[PDB]
Amino acid sequence: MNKQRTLLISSRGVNYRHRHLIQDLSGLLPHSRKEPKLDTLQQLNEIAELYNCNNVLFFEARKHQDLYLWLSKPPNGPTIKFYIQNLHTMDELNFTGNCLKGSRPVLSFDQRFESSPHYQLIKELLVHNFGVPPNARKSKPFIDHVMSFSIVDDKIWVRTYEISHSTDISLVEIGPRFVMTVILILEGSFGGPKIYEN
Amino acid sequence: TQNTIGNIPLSAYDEMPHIGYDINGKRIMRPAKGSALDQLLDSIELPEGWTGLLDKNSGSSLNLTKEELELISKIQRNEQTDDSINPYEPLIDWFTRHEEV
Amino acid sequence: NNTKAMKHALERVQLPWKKHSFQEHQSVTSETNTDEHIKDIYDDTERELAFYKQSLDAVLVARDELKRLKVPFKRPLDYFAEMVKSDEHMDKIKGKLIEEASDKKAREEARRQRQLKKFGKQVQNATLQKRQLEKRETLEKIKSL
Amino acid sequence: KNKHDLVDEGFNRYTFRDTENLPDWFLEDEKEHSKINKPITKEAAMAIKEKIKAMNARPIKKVAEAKARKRMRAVARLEK
């Protein structure tokens, strides 16, 4: 019943670490239509229109240390500008554990996401955008990891834990551990007046 | 895909009676138990679309269709890939039709 | 910051999850956890454990609801499918873990071998004289009878 | 790559060329120099070496003769 597709795009100005985030998210998401590079705002709807994308992850970097994810629904959806502060990529050696490449995750959430309609919208968009469809073409059956989402100090801390089994269950943390500071929410996709500000 | 095992080597499953698992978890069984005669025949007079690699769906050798083999040859001798087109269309003068004042 | 258009956005974007199976959604909300109960908010040691507790909660609930349906949960150890981190990458991590374990054991045996070089002489002469004490002990135990 | 992808790639620098009416002394100079250097793999070179290898390529005779060569080499390095 749920049928979705993500577009993973980049901007010129993305460094080493941020490139590894597009690598590892394209790994974890089986419905990730990975795209190389974009140069410029309005074009991204049309890219999504070509590949039949239900979602568009636009990773921007203005100053080369920064990262700004522009999560969106293409045709008329409310796009969300983030600023991602902390970063620990997939290829950091302290993390131990193999998730299946693009298996169905389990989305974990928080109480304070239902506190406002504001955090309710990002909660929903993280469910179907950062999540998975039940029958994605590159998706692996037996469920093997989670997506831990939790808010503290007005920012959502994202982690991906591989579940560990013994013969009841453990779970060792891996993958992109990062905060998401909700900067801005537009009314339409990359156009129209701004709904939310900080 | 319907075999759902990625860029892993098919060295694994050579000792199994199945090639991997698929969406909604069930056993993709290896399709046939061929004769030793047929296997020796396919190492002397190799199959039509023989490609030397192993299929992901089944342990059997991945062959090619007649149409694909035709398409590879038509790339290498250049021979017009997309048919139902004329190589020599009449120059339809879409701009000189209307005289300038 | 008008919540009106936000609710209008929730009208268009959302899909009915309660009107369908869990498998279509697969999102255990860990409501009743605000994660503001954590002491040492900028120290990230209690915070790691608190996030771990939240994750483990959602895993157990998802295990229950997914077991309620006839869809399997565990990795069978019978499909060797493609994983996120490559095998050479996993050999790098495992290499590092065995390296750190060998370094810890190296410092433990360092204390051991240094003690053997310091008190090796005393070990020699004590064991030898104790052996001779045992010689005279046994010989006295024969000479008495 | 599927059929649809190769049909795109098929339109080269060298498409839309007549070949049947033309004299041979012209085509034998075109066909030598009409080869677009597409990237290869080791994976393909393996199979094409496995495709060309014929039956009498490695009999018992030539295996025994190969060892007869290497024994003579192992003797020639004790001649010094």
From Swiss-Prot, chain A:
Main location group: nucleus
Cellular localisation: Nucleus, Nucleolus
UniProt keyword annotation of Phosphoprotein present: yes
UniProt-recorded Gene Ontology molecular function terms: 5S rRNA binding; RNA binding; rRNA primary transcript binding
Keyword presence, Nucleus: yes
Quaternary structure annotation from Swiss-Prot or TrEMBL: Part of a complex that includes BRX1, RPF1, RPF2 and SSF1 or SSF2.
Primary role: Required for biogenesis of the 60S ribosomal subunit.
Family: Belongs to the BRX1 family.
General remark: Present with 13200 molecules/cell in log phase SD medium.
Identification of the protein by name: Ribosome biogenesis protein BRX1
Species: Saccharomyces cerevisiae (strain ATCC 204508 / S288c) (Baker's yeast)
Gene, per the UniProt record: BRX1
UniProtKB/Swiss-Prot annotation, chain B:
Stretch of the intact protein here: 153 to 253 of 807
Note: Present with 2680 molecules/cell in log phase SD medium.
Localization per record: Nucleus, Nucleolus; Nucleus, Nucleoplasm
Domain of life: Eukaryota
Positions of disulphide bridges: none
Family: Belongs to the WD repeat BOP1/ERB1 family.
Subunit field text: Component of the NOP7 complex, composed of ERB1, NOP7 and YTM1. The complex is held together by ERB1, which interacts with NOP7 via its N-terminal domain and with YTM1 via a high-affinity interaction between the seven-bladed beta-propeller domains of the 2 proteins. The NOP7 complex associates with the 66S pre-ribosome. Also interacts with NOG1.
Name of the protein in its database record: Ribosome biogenesis protein ERB1
Curated annotation (Swiss-Prot), chain C:
GO cellular component: nuclear periphery; nucleolus; preribosome, large subunit precursor
PTM statement from Swiss-Prot or TrEMBL: Sumoylated.
Main location: nucleus
Coiled coil: 39-70, 96-145
Subcellular location(s) of the protein: Nucleus, Nucleolus
Keywords, ordered alphabetically: Coiled coil, Nucleus, Phosphoprotein, Ribosome biogenesis, Ubl conjugation
Family assignment from sequence similarity: Belongs to the EBP2 family.
Subunit structure: Interacts with LOC1, NOP12, SIZ2, ULS1 and WSS1.
Function summary: Required for the processing of the 27S pre-rRNA. Probably involved in the step of the processing of the 27 SA precursor into the 27 SB intermediate.
Name recorded for this polypeptide: rRNA-processing protein EBP2
Annotated gene: EBP2
UniProtKB/Swiss-Prot annotation, chain D:
Residue ranges of the TM segments: none
UniProt-annotated location(s): Nucleus, Nucleolus
Origin: domain of life: Eukaryota
Subunit structure: Component of the nucleolar and nucleoplasmic pre-60S ribosomal particle. Interacts with the snoRNA-associated proteins NOP1 and NOP58.
Functional description taken from the UniProt entry: Required for proper assembly of pre-ribosomal particles during the biogenesis of the 60S ribosomal subunit. Specifically methylates the guanosine in position 2922 of the 25S rRNA at the stage of 27S pre-rRNA maturation. Also methylates the uridine in position 2921 in the absence of methylation of this residue guided by snoRNA snR52 at the stage of 35S pre-rRNA maturation.
Family per similarity comment: Belongs to the class I-like SAM-binding methyltransferase superfamily. RNA methyltransferase RlmE family. SPB1 subfamily.
Protein name: 27S pre-rRNA (guanosine(2922)-2'-O)-methyltransferase
Species of the source: Saccharomyces cerevisiae (strain ATCC 204508 / S288c)
